[model samples]
Target chain A: ASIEVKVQQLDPVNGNKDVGTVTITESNYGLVFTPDLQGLSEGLHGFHIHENPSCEPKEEEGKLTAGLGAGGHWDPKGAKQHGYPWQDDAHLGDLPALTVLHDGTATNPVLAPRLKHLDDVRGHSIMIHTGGDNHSDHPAPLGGGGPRMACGVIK
Target chain B: ASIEVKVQQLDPVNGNKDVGTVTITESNYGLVFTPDLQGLSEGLHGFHIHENPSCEPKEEEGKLTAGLGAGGHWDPKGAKQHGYPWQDDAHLGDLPALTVLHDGTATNPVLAPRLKHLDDVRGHSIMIHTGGDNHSDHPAPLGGGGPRMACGVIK
Candidate 1:
């Protein structure tokens, strides 16, 4: 099975614009992520599957929250921790870091063999964080994704 | 801030199709949700803001999963327990029930005065359950919003 998610910028004021597409293919081995994205910051960004497919902003107290509606990483097992994508105990949503080029273009294909089936990613989302994902709770929670930069609803 | 979310039908083979719109506006007290929906089961249906913006079909093990991608209700507070919409301690995603008439349409506007601002609903989703929401944890969990029948991503 396969699915395509359209990644968009999370701009509340100016409105959101399309950034690129992330195509996910499911095979017997696991899942594969193909990113064809542009207009991104040049660096390694935290990348993973969020529990929710939403890219909506949520209000907290009196302030607007970013990507709060997407919930946290997809951790159905209650791992409550981040780790390498290959680790069995890692959060189910954990994925390899995404590297953007100096030209603001990213065309890297990452794989997750641990993902036994494509069904796991069907109703979730692919998110790109503002900071690098260390896959650990040390520096910050959920690899300190900082602010949610881009998101796409998987179908 | 104001936003509009496009709701869709949850179908297995054809994927999701746009059914209606749910427009939200920020008010002084909270947020107001004005729903203009159609093609739904008659009578009151369980309604709430789901965590994700997706209505994609997810799989578990080898079997197909219903609105699995949408995650659970928007419960950022980790209050796993379900309660009334007015309960301050309840999940932030809780909303009043949505009613569909015998004519196969529903057009009633509900308010979420507890919602601080429009940002709270931006990137989330609106979900309609197969059953009525009791707003309690009795009989079944999460108001027995049995099997998600419809979903919409809040943009």
Candidate 2:
């Protein structure tokens, strides 16, 4: 019962915008994102914990699935790749792959209990899609550079 | 119905995130966000159109404020700093300002007709806040920065 995350943005790992936030401690099974990124662009880019939270910009309903509506990435256990958030089965929104430092910043401390419990995502919506997310959404690259490069919602 | 955006990942204006997307159109509004953005020091960074729709992170009363619970930015004629969504007493999330390139890229093109119908926002959520939004959030440097560096919702 000690969650207070208010992260609003961060969807670039090869460039800038390494948004920050993470403080969810109710993990008996879910909620954990110890990040604080910061104007990043160092390495490994692919982070998620999405599933409808709304950050604004609607109308992708019939062939307009921007980021697939932020609906998949807190892998209940379905971990397959992008491992690091806690590594065991990984994919609960994994979280530990941001290095950045040519001058930009990124401290990195990723965390995620099991995926789903910081009061259940609070408002649900977390994105950064564009490149990297070997979590595999199938079809070679439908979850990688298919579009969408920034988002936030989890009030 | 001639909408077809698909660039994704472009956050490097001033340094937060500028993201991309915009598909499915029947009325058509506008969204061109093109930013290969990769570690530069060029110029211009300030975009908008927030107000929750459903990227899903809702916690509204407990204070996790995912995209500020996808609220605000939908002033339906309540007008206030009014004039700039094409000018007519603007504020339907007043947008139009996406340029950042020296090589990092940030192709711009924003036209808001309430982003073009559909519940006007369905549920709400769309941010980029890192800096630059001279619409008037108070003289705090154009109500940009502090949080929400890359966000996406609305469909």
Highest TM-score: give the candidate number: 1
True contacts kept of each: 0.00, 0.00
Residue A135 in model 1: shift from native, Å? 1.0
lDDT of 1 by residue, A9-79 (tens): 78766787899998888643356677789998866678899898788877879667767788888889988
* Cα TM-score of candidate 2: 0.33
Q: Taking the candidates in order, what DockQ does each have? A: 0.01, 0.02
Number of the top-ranking candidate, with lDDT as the measure: 1
Candidate 2 lDDT over A17-101, as tens digits, reads 3266545454333444544545544433455666577544434654444445566555556655444333456555654333233
Candidate 2's error at A86, in angstroms? 26
lDDT for A114 in candidate 1 is: 62
Residue pairs with backbone overlap in model 1:
A54-B53, A55-B123, A56-B122, A56-B123, A57-B123, A58-B120, A59-B120, A123-B69
